[PDB]
Amino acid sequence: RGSHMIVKNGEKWMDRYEIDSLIGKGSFGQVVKAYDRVEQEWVAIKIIKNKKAFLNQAQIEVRLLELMNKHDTEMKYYIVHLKRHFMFRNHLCLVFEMLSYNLYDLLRNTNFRGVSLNLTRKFAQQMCTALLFLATPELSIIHCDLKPENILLCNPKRSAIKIVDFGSSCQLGQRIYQYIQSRFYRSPEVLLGMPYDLAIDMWSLGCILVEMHTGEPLFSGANEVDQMNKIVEVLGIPPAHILDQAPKARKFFEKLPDGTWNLKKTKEYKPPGTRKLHNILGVETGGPGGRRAGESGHTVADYLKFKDLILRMLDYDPKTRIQPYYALQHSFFKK
Ligand SMILES: CCCCc1nc2ccc(-c3cc(N)nc(N)c3)nc2n1CCCC
Numbered sequence: 001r002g003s004h005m006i007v008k009n010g011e012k013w014m015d016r017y018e019i020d021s022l023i024g025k026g027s028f029g030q031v032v033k034a035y036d037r038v039e040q041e042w043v044a045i046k047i048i049k050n051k052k053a054f055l056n057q058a059q060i061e062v063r064l065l066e067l068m069n070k071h072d073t074e075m076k077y078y079i080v081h082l083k084r085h086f087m088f089r090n091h092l093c094l095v096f097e098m099l100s101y102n103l104y105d106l107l108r109n110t111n112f113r114g115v116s117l118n119l120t121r122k123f124a125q126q127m128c129t130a131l132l133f134l135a136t137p138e139l140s141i142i143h144c145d146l147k148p149e150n151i152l153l154c155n156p157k158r159s160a161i162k163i164v165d166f167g168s169s170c171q172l173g174q175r176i177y178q179y180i181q182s183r184f185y186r187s188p189e190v191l192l193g194m195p196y197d198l199a200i201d202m203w204s205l206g207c208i209l210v211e212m213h214t215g216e217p218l219f220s221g222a223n224e225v226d227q228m229n230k231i232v233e234v235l236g237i238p239p240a241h242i243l244d245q246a247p248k249a250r251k252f253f254e255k256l257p258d259g260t261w262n263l264k265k266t267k268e269y270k271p272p273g274t275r276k277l278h279n280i281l282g283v284e285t286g287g288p289g290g291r292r293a294g295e296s297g298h299t300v301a302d303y304l305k306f307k308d309l310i311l312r313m314l315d316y317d318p319k320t321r322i323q324p325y326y327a328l329q330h331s332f333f334k335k
């Protein structure tokens with residue numbers, strides 16, 4: 001009775017999996033920790049709800065994960081490994097390798113004061129390599145839900161990360177879901193109802209990397225109008241050539257007699273472009289809240305390279321927004 005599978009700690013499925021506990025829940029269903037007796041290892045089992053819409057998303061996730069696993073690059077190891085899938089008690093079950101804390105858990109463990117720029121750079125370098133993998137023409141996968149929660153440590157005392165959850169994903173040119181991206185990480189082009197490509201994931205990554213170092217969301221909107229207003233505080237009014245083509249431009253902006261755009265009033269924001277990323281990152285003032293003052297690996301030069309890469313990932317124009325190959329060549333990553 002209901003969407004969920006009933007799970008009692010202690011049960012053993014198909015005399016292969018011993019169920020230990022429920023790690024977590026989500027929109028899609030349940031994740032349980034279990035021991036795979038034939039592979040001799042812990043696995044995370046994603047149990048999809050018995051409902052057409054969740055079954056359908058999971059069936060795309062299986063196809064995209066099996067497509068990615070076919071590739072013979074080392075870059076594929078930045079994406080969670082789907083061991084197996086099977087039907088059991090009327091639920092699609094996806095058997096994953098067992099990973100560790102998500103990046104949101106990391107932030108919580110720092111009490112939301114942020115991780116070091118040194119660890120930020122290691123996460124950024126791996127995420128740019130994962131996005132470069134996804135942009136493989138034969139893949140051309142848009143994750144569509146990048147957020148700190150969907151990026152997991154492989155092991156709790158190492159820097160190595162992987163991306164999870166391709167439930168909302170599509171391939172270049174597809175339009176499947178009415179709304180896409182988690183609101184804090186949602187690109188201007190999705191807010192504006194414009195066509196979206198792999199650049200929307202680069203937008204999400206920019207936002208994620210700032211949060212990981214400051215401890216707080218860059219753009220914490222409570223609704224789409226609040227989201228776009230918080231973006232404008234930092235980045236200014238979007239270019240006219242974008243707003244002139246945007247189906248939902250008039251949800252956030254008004255075009256003036258001159259042909260200049262500015263913000264609609266809502267019916268309490270800093271003037272456009274005056275909440276500088278330079279001051280959010282504390283480039284010249286000791287990093288976020290001054291907390292990194294003196295500390296090694298937190299110099300003005302380091303911060304300027306970080307700021308400059310983030311602003312290339314947060315370009316309003318998805319045609320000119322930095323692409324994964326060029327992001328990897330950035331001075332921020334030089335040894
Ligand atoms: C030790 C604590 C558990 C670590 C872990 N290993 C995981 C492996 C895969 C997935 C996962 C994969 C996909 N494609 N979609 C979702 N939604 C979750 N999730 C994992 N998790 C997180 C637990 C889920 C709350």
Ligand SMILES: [Cl-]
Binds near residue numbers: 223224225226
């Ligand atoms: Cl709204």
